Amino acid sequence: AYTNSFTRGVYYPDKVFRSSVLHSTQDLFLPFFSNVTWFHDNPVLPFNDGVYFASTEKSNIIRGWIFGTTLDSKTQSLLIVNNATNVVIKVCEFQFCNDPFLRVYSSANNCTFEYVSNLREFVFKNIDGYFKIYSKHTPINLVRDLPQGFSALEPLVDLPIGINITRFQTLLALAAYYVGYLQPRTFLLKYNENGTITDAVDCALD
Amino acid sequence: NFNFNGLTGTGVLTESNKKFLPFQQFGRDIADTTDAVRDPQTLEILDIT
Numbered sequence: 173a174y175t176n177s178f179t180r181g182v183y184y185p186d187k188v189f190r191s192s193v194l195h196s197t198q199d200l201f202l203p204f205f206s207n208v209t210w211f212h213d214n215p216v217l218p219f220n221d222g223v224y225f226a227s228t229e230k231s232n233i234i235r236g237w238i239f240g241t242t243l244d245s246k247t248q249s250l251l252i253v254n255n256a257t258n259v260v261i262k263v264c265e266f267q268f269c270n271d272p273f274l275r276v277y278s279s280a281n282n283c284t285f286e287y288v289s290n291l292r293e294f295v296f297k298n299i300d301g302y303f304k305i306y307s308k309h310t311p312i313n314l315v316r317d318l319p320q321g322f323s324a325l326e327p328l329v330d331l332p333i334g335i336n337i338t339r340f341q342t343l344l345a346l347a348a349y350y351v352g353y354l355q356p357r358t359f360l361l362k363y364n365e366n367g368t369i370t371d372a373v374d375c376a377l378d
Numbered sequence: 379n380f381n382f383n384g385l386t387g388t389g390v391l392t393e394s395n396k397k398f399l400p401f402q403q404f405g406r407d408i409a410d411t412t413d414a415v416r417d418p419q420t421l422e423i424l425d426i427t
């Protein structure tokens with residue numbers, strides 16, 4: 173299934189405050205009105221240059237994601253999971269299961285990094301060894317499909333994991349979600365008087 | 379004169395009304411000079427006119 177990304181997936185490109193100003197920036201962004209894949213489903217998906225991920229949900233069925241390349245302990249992989257009390261992030265040579273669910277992996281070894289902390293939207297980037305996560309949450313009129321309108325994702329964490337990533341997979345607890353890929357685009361960002369991005373122009377759209 | 383995390387300059391540091399989001403560390407001028415900064419110890423926001 174497919175659906176259309178109605179200006180969703182903009183995020184704060186840097187930690188510099190700006191207000192009442194229009195600023196042009198060149199970065200990996202989800203192009204406006206992009207053809208995004210629609211799931212209802214836990215197959216392995218490519219990561220490319222980065223992912224936009226969104227979930228529309230009511231019972232918190234989606235609990236996290238796994239990122240990596242071989243996903244078979246021959247290489248390191250990144251595990252991100254949100255349990256009932258804490259967000260947990262680990263980078264280990266995980267031997268993941270054929271059908272992970274909350275029983276994600278058979279074994280874990282050579283672990284070098286660990287960190288412990290409606291519509292829900294996320295963006296995942298991997299640049300020069302840094303894995304950056306942005307998100308925002310918002311109540312919306314429907315659970316089945318992606319809404320209209322503009323909103324900007326705030327940075328959530330910036331992990332210096334330093335690992336190669338080419339594929340990823342969603343973790344479910346025993347709902348619908350959307351996946352889009354970021355591309356190098358030039359965007360003109362409108363910052364309001366409160367310093368929040370309130371609109372954007374995808375300079376290569378039309 | 380000031381030196382915030384290496385950011386070195388001169389100005390009349392003043393308490394800022396600018397509503398920096400929790401992740402933001404600096405503010406910029408059109409010339410990309412720093413216009414506001416977050417104190418690395420108190421985390422308060424200061425104007426740099």
Ligand SMILES: *[C@@H]1O[C@H](CO)[C@@H](O[C@@H]2O[C@H](CO)[C@@H](O)[C@H](O)[C@H]2NC(C)=O)[C@H](O)[C@H]1NC(C)=O
Binds near residue numbers: 241242338
């Ligand atoms: C990151 O991992 C991918 C595998 O997922 C590597 O991809 C290979 O890259 C070489 C060229 O460098 C190609 O000849 C292979 O065909 C690629 N394999 C696949 C399965 O696509 C990639 O090289 C890795 N990069 C780093 C820096 O480790």
Ligand SMILES: *[C@@H]1O[C@H](CO)[C@@H](O[C@@H]2O[C@H](CO)[C@@H](O)[C@H](O)[C@H]2NC(C)=O)[C@H](O)[C@H]1NC(C)=O
Binds near residue numbers: 255256257259288
């Ligand atoms: C969420 O994950 C954390 C791990 O980061 C869990 O904390 C561990 O809990 C066990 C007991 O079940 C302790 O033995 C460990 O020492 C804890 N680790 C840390 C780092 O605190 C936490 O219990 C999980 N939450 C739930 C509800 O299962």
Ligand SMILES: *[C@@H]1O[C@H](CO)[C@@H](O[C@@H]2O[C@H](CO)[C@@H](O)[C@H](O)[C@H]2NC(C)=O)[C@H](O)[C@H]1NC(C)=O
Binds near residue numbers: 281282
């Ligand atoms: C942990 O990672 C290291 C690589 O950093 C693995 O080292 C390899 O070990 C096998 C024997 O088990 C050797 O044949 C390879 O030549 C080693 N690789 C390198 C680059 O030296 C190690 O196996 C991993 N640990 C486990 C338990 O699998």
Ligand SMILES: *[C@@H]1O[C@H](CO)[C@@H](O[C@@H]2O[C@H](CO)[C@@H](O)[C@H](O)[C@H]2NC(C)=O)[C@H](O)[C@H]1NC(C)=O
Binds near residue numbers: 364365366
């Ligand atoms: C900028 O932020 C302020 C809050 O810091 C907003 O002011 C509030 O707006 C609501 C209506 O949305 C009023 O009910 C409150 O009384 C206002 N508070 C104050 C202190 O004025 C303001 O609307 C925001 N502006 C924009 C353009 O987002």
Ligand SMILES: *[C@@H]1O[C@H](CO)[C@@H](O)[C@H](O)[C@H]1NC(C)=O
Binds near residue numbers: 174207
């Ligand atoms: C979205 O892309 C797929 C190919 O991945 C294509 O078959 C489909 O027709 C496209 N849908 C729209 C609405 O453009």
Ligand SMILES: *[C@@H]1O[C@H](CO)[C@@H](O)[C@H](O)[C@H]1NC(C)=O
Binds near residue numbers: 419420
């Ligand atoms: C640095 O000192 C201030 C008090 O001047 C304190 O509030 C702050 O917590 C300290 N830094 C950290 C990281 O705790």
